[PDB]
Coordinates of all heavy atoms in Angstrom, one line a residue:
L508 N -8.2 6.4 0.1 CA -7.3 6.6 1.2 C -5.9 6.8 0.6 O -5.1 7.6 1.2 CB -7.3 5.4 2.2 CG -6.4 5.6 3.4 CD1 -6.7 6.9 4.2 CD2 -6.4 4.4 4.3
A509 N -5.5 6.1 -0.4 CA -4.2 6.2 -1.1 C -4.1 7.6 -1.7 O -3.0 8.2 -1.5 CB -4.1 5.1 -2.1
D510 N -5.1 8.0 -2.4 CA -5.1 9.4 -3.0 C -4.9 10.5 -1.9 O -4.2 11.4 -2.1 CB -6.3 9.6 -3.8 CG -6.2 9.1 -5.2 OD1 -5.1 8.7 -5.6 OD2 -7.3 9.0 -5.9
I511 N -5.5 10.3 -0.8 CA -5.4 11.2 0.3 C -4.0 11.3 0.9 O -3.4 12.3 1.1 CB -6.4 10.9 1.4 CG1 -7.8 11.3 1.0 CG2 -6.1 11.6 2.7 CD1 -8.9 10.9 1.9
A512 N -3.4 10.1 1.1 CA -2.1 10.0 1.6 C -1.1 10.6 0.6 O -0.1 11.3 1.1 CB -1.7 8.6 1.9
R513 N -1.3 10.4 -0.6 CA -0.4 11.0 -1.7 C -0.6 12.5 -1.7 O 0.3 13.3 -1.9 CB -0.7 10.3 -3.0 CG 0.6 10.0 -3.8 CD 0.3 9.3 -5.1 NE -0.3 10.2 -6.1 CZ -1.5 10.0 -6.6 NH1 -2.3 9.0 -6.2 NH2 -2.0 10.9 -7.5
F514 N -1.9 13.0 -1.6 CA -2.2 14.4 -1.7 C -1.6 15.2 -0.6 O -1.1 16.3 -0.9 CB -3.8 14.5 -1.7 CG -4.2 16.0 -1.8 CD1 -4.2 16.6 -3.0 CD2 -4.6 16.7 -0.6 CE1 -4.6 18.0 -3.1 CE2 -5.0 18.0 -0.7 CZ -5.0 18.6 -1.9
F515 N -1.5 14.6 0.6 CA -1.0 15.4 1.7 C 0.5 15.0 2.0 O 1.1 15.3 3.0 CB -1.8 15.1 3.0 CG -3.2 15.7 2.9 CD1 -4.3 14.9 2.8 CD2 -3.4 17.1 3.0 CE1 -5.6 15.4 2.7 CE2 -4.6 17.6 2.9 CZ -5.7 16.8 2.8
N516 N 1.0 14.2 1.0 CA 2.4 13.8 1.1 C 2.8 13.2 2.4 O 3.8 13.5 3.0 CB 3.3 14.9 0.7 CG 4.7 14.5 0.3 OD1 4.9 13.4 -0.3 ND2 5.7 15.4 0.5
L517 N 1.9 12.3 2.9 CA 2.1 11.7 4.2 C 3.1 10.5 4.1 O 3.1 9.8 3.1 CB 0.8 11.2 4.9 CG -0.2 12.2 5.1 CD1 -1.5 11.6 5.7 CD2 0.3 13.3 6.0
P518 N 4.0 10.4 5.1 CA 4.9 9.2 5.1 C 4.0 8.0 5.2 O 3.2 7.8 6.0 CB 5.7 9.4 6.4 CG 5.0 10.5 7.2 CD 4.3 11.3 6.2
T519 N 4.3 7.0 4.3 CA 3.5 5.9 4.1 C 4.3 4.6 4.2 O 5.4 4.6 3.8 CB 2.8 5.9 2.7 OG1 1.9 7.0 2.6 CG2 1.9 4.6 2.5
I520 N 3.7 3.6 4.9 CA 4.4 2.3 5.0 C 3.6 1.2 4.5 O 2.4 1.1 4.8 CB 4.8 2.0 6.5 CG1 5.8 3.1 7.0 CG2 5.4 0.7 6.6 CD1 6.1 3.0 8.4
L521 N 4.1 0.4 3.6 CA 3.5 -0.8 3.1 C 4.0 -2.0 3.7 O 5.2 -2.2 3.9 CB 3.6 -0.8 1.5 CG 3.3 0.4 0.8 CD1 3.6 0.3 -0.7 CD2 1.8 0.7 0.9
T522 N 3.1 -3.0 4.0 CA 3.6 -4.2 4.6 C 2.6 -5.4 4.1 O 1.4 -5.2 3.9 CB 3.6 -4.2 6.1 OG1 4.2 -5.4 6.6 CG2 2.2 -4.0 6.7
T523 N 3.2 -6.5 3.9 CA 2.5 -7.7 3.4 C 2.8 -8.9 4.3 O 3.8 -9.0 5.0 CB 2.8 -8.1 1.9 OG1 4.2 -8.4 1.8 CG2 2.4 -6.9 1.0
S524 N 1.8 -9.9 4.3 CA 2.0 -11.1 5.1 C 2.0 -12.3 4.2 O 1.1 -12.7 3.6 CB 0.7 -11.2 6.0 OG 0.9 -12.3 6.9
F525 N 3.2 -12.9 4.2 CA 3.4 -14.2 3.5 C 3.0 -14.1 2.0 O 2.2 -14.9 1.6 CB 2.7 -15.3 4.2 CG 3.1 -16.7 3.9 CD1 2.5 -17.8 4.5 CD2 4.1 -16.9 3.0 CE1 2.9 -19.1 4.2 CE2 4.5 -18.2 2.7 CZ 3.9 -19.3 3.3
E526 N 3.5 -13.1 1.3 CA 3.0 -12.8 0.0 C 3.5 -13.8 -1.1 O 3.0 -13.8 -2.2 CB 3.5 -11.4 -0.4 CG 5.0 -11.2 -0.5 CD 5.5 -9.8 -0.9 OE1 4.7 -8.9 -0.7 OE2 6.6 -9.7 -1.4
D527 N 4.4 -14.7 -0.7 CA 4.9 -15.7 -1.6 C 4.1 -17.0 -1.4 O 4.5 -18.0 -1.8 CB 6.4 -16.0 -1.3 CG 7.3 -14.9 -1.8 OD1 6.9 -14.2 -2.8 OD2 8.4 -14.8 -1.2
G528 N 2.9 -16.8 -0.8 CA 2.0 -17.9 -0.7 C 0.6 -17.5 -1.2 O 0.5 -16.6 -2.0
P529 N -0.5 -18.2 -0.7 CA -1.8 -17.9 -1.2 C -2.3 -16.6 -0.8 O -3.3 -16.1 -1.5 CB -2.6 -19.0 -0.4 CG -1.6 -20.1 -0.2 CD -0.4 -19.4 0.1
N530 N -1.7 -15.9 0.2 CA -2.1 -14.5 0.5 C -1.9 -13.6 -0.6 O -2.7 -12.6 -0.8 CB -1.3 -14.1 1.7 CG -1.9 -14.6 3.1 OD1 -2.8 -15.4 3.1 ND2 -1.2 -14.2 4.2
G531 N -0.9 -13.9 -1.5 CA -0.8 -13.2 -2.7 C 0.0 -11.9 -2.6 O 0.3 -11.4 -1.5
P532 N 0.3 -11.3 -3.8 CA 1.0 -10.0 -3.9 C 0.2 -8.8 -3.4 O -1.0 -8.9 -3.4 CB 1.4 -9.9 -5.4 CG 0.2 -10.6 -6.0 CD -0.1 -11.7 -5.1
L533 N 0.9 -7.7 -3.1 CA 0.2 -6.4 -2.8 C -0.5 -6.0 -4.1 O 0.1 -6.1 -5.2 CB 1.2 -5.4 -2.3 CG 0.7 -4.1 -1.9 CD1 -0.1 -4.3 -0.6 CD2 1.8 -3.1 -1.6
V534 N -1.7 -5.4 -3.9 CA -2.4 -4.9 -5.1 C -1.6 -3.9 -5.8 O -0.9 -3.0 -5.2 CB -3.8 -4.3 -4.7 CG1 -4.7 -5.3 -4.3 CG2 -3.6 -3.2 -3.6
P535 N -1.6 -3.9 -7.2 CA -0.7 -3.1 -8.0 C -0.8 -1.6 -7.8 O 0.2 -0.9 -7.9 CB -1.2 -3.5 -9.4 CG -1.9 -4.7 -9.3 CD -2.6 -4.7 -8.0
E536 N -2.0 -1.1 -7.5 CA -2.2 0.3 -7.3 C -1.3 0.9 -6.1 O -0.7 2.0 -6.3 CB -3.6 0.7 -7.0 CG -4.6 0.5 -8.2 CD -4.9 -0.9 -8.5 OE1 -4.6 -1.8 -7.7 OE2 -5.6 -1.2 -9.6
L537 N -1.2 0.1 -5.1 CA -0.4 0.6 -3.9 C 1.1 0.7 -4.2 O 1.8 1.6 -3.8 CB -0.7 -0.3 -2.7 CG -2.0 -0.1 -2.1 CD1 -2.2 -1.1 -0.9 CD2 -2.2 1.3 -1.6

């Protein structure tokens, strides 16, 4: 899905929930 968004140059939004806790950081690829 990430490659597709990049391929079509779509506006992309990243969001995380409480990443400074056990939920953890966003995966590095994104």
Side-chain angles (χ1 to χ4, degrees):
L508 182 59
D510 276 347
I511 287 174
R513 225 180 68 247
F514 180 77
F515 294 107
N516 202 27
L517 302 178
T519 299
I520 298 174
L521 309 173
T522 185
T523 60
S524 182
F525 197 179
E526 63 179 23
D527 285 332
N530 281 2
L533 186 68
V534 288
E536 289 79 7
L537 288 180

